[PDB]
Structure 1
Amino acid sequence: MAANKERTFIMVKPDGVQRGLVGKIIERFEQKGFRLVALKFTWASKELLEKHYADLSARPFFPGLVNYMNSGPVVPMVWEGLNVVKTGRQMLGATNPADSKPGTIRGDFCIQVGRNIIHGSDAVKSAEKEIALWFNEKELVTWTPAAKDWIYE
């Protein structure tokens, strides 16, 4: 419940892996002061993707979206810190890269919304759901950064 212990789900999409952006994305979160909680590299099954995108099941683009997200591997992650959900979204930039400003991940590194390299949870509740979908609890690491008292009041 503690503000500083909020968690979000960030995922490098197949285009982000293909284009060599995994390290650069992780570095953005590390240098900011956010704390890694979970990390893996996986080819997501259509089953998992259909759960992740379940709200979109009736949309005409849904099958193509699932097929695309199943067309190469992804890097799911969990990050922890104060307002990491909303601040994470800020760091990512607008969902449509056209509107993402320079300095943001999407603003610096991609062009078109269907190839927008990265996903971040849009709310605390959706983050909790996404974390539970993509990770089991034993994959979530609890640790204490040496720099903690220089990052947080």
Structure 2
Amino acid sequence: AANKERTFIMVKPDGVQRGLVGKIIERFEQKGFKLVALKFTWASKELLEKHYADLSARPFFPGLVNYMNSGPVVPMVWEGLNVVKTGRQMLGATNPADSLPGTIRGDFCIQVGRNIIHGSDAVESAEKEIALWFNEKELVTWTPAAKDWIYE
């Protein structure tokens, strides 16, 4: 129930550009989390604006949308016990400068505007983001052979 918790992770345009797709996935694979959905795509401004709706009334919003629309992205859904929160920990701090060596952001990027990845915030927002980026038909259900060795 708690092991079925899901989160949305997306490789931003700079992550794709600098060749970090394999490395990011591998970090989640290795940890024992389960890949539920994955696709490569060009996000539409219309989708980016929904995704980033909270920054609407914030300065330079259109610059962000434009930037997110400048290259393809890799949206994903990972499942497991406390994946939202743990996922966030693995990514490191949103601002790369406060990210610790060992976290994804700590090892691979420098500035907040080019921080290679996004991971849902909390369960509720993970929920909204998954639904925005994927159809229910794009969410694959399977059972890893190593399951019993990962969970009690």
Runs (5+) with no aligned partner, structure 1: none
Deviation at 1:60, TM superposition (A): 1.1
Deviation at 1:141, TM superposition (A): 0.3
Aligned length: 152
Deviation at 1:33, TM superposition (A): 0.2
Deviations 1:75-124 (A, max 9, x none): 00000000000000000000000000000000000000000000000100
Aligned-partner SS, 1:78: strand
Runs (5+) with no aligned partner, structure 2: none
Point out 4+ residue stretches in structure 1 off by more than 3 angstroms.
Answer: none
Give the TM-score, by structure 2 length: 1.00
> Equivalent residues in 2 for 1:1-150 (5 A)?
2-150=1-149
Q: CA RMSD in A?
A: 0.3
Could you tell me how far apart the structure 2 residues matched to 1:122 and 1:94 are? 12
Could you tell me how far apart the structure 2 residues matched to 1:60 and 1:141 are? 38
Q: Between the two proteins, what is the percent identity of the paired residues?
A: 98
Deviation at 1:6, TM superposition (A): 0.1
Deviation at 1:61, TM superposition (A): 1.7
Deviation at 1:11, TM superposition (A): 0.1
Deviations 1:4-30 (A, max 9, x none): 000000000000000000000000000
Could you tell me how far apart the structure 1 residues matched to 2:92 and 2:61 are? 23
Deviations 1:40-95 (A, max 9, x none): 00000000000000011111121000000000000000000000000000000000
Could you tell me how far apart the structure 2 residues matched to 1:85 and 1:92 are? 11
Aligned-partner SS, 2:63: helix
Aligned-partner SS, 1:38: strand
Could you tell me how far apart the structure 2 residues matched to 1:132 and 1:54 are? 15
